[PDB]
Amino acid sequence: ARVAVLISGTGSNLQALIDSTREPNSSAQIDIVISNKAAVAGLDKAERAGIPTRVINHKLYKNRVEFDSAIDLVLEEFSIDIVCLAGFMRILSGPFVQKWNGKMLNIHPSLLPSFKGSNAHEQALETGVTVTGCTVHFVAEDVDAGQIILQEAVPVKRGDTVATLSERVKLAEHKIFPAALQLVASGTVQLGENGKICWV
């Protein structure tokens, strides 16, 4: 499968995915890395891996849909089959999400449906769970309300902060995200006609 990876910052998930798709049995191929914010470290790990990078600036488009279309042009230019959101902090418009329905994966640092949204670790710590984790799911029009592919639980140690909790969750992210991509690229997992996760 031809894969695009959309980032916004560090790209430690991107790096984790790069490492796995370089493996001989990878069903996946990272053909383009797109970022909405220039001069972010994800663009380096990508360039350091010899992967084309493209910066599309959401702040330069009048419409959110004009902005998604900028991305789809590149997705079609690179003949992409699968889109991985790896730290991408822009909500996509309905038609774009509909177009890539069942072809777009996201990594979210909670055990969904818990702690939907942008400050999941903050939420988890205020609530006081002792177990959190991360989730790979399909992007649906309901933000973080798509079909789950993989999940890994991670412990909340006492005295944790966003800094430490998120350090620990990210190690799990770096496992289930490559795994999930491989599941979808290989066609082992798909989005069933009934709209639930379908194993094959």
Ligand X SMILES: NCC(=O)N[C@@H]1O[C@H](COP(=O)([O-])[O-])[C@@H](O)[C@H]1O
Ligand Y SMILES: Nc1nc2ccn(CCCCc3csc(C(=O)N[C@@H](CCC(=O)O)C(=O)O)c3F)c2c(=O)[nH]1
Query: Is 122 annotated as contributing to ligand binding?
Result: no
174 an active-site residue?
A: no
Residues with Cβ within 8 Å of 60's Cβ and at least 6 positions away in sequence, in order, are none
Q: Which of 167, 141, 139, 140 is CA-nearest to residue 154?
A: 167
Site residues, ligand Y (CB under 6 A): 85, 88-92, 97, 106, 117-118, 139, 141, 143-144
Q: Which does 85 bind (CB under 5 to 8 A by kind): ligand Y, ligand X, none?
A: ligand Y
Which entry of ligand Y, ligand X, none binds 87, CB below 5 to 8 A by partner kind?
A: ligand X
Q: Is 170 in the site for ligand X (CB under 6 A)?
A: yes
**Which stretch in 67-75, 105-113, 145-153, 190-198 sits in contact with ligand X by CB under 6 A?**
105-113
**Is 129 within any annotated ligand binding site?**
no
CA-to-CA distance for 184 and 146, rounded, in angstroms? 15
| Residue 153 interacts with which of ligand Y, ligand X, none, CB < 5 to 8 Å by class | none
Are the C-beta atoms of 82 and 185 separated by less than 8 Å?
yes
108 binds ligand X (CB under 6 A): yes
Given a contact cutoff of 8 angstroms between Cβ atoms, the answer to whether 28 and 182 are in contact is: yes
Shortest reach from residue 112's CB to ligand X, in Å: 11
Catalytic positions, please?
A: 108
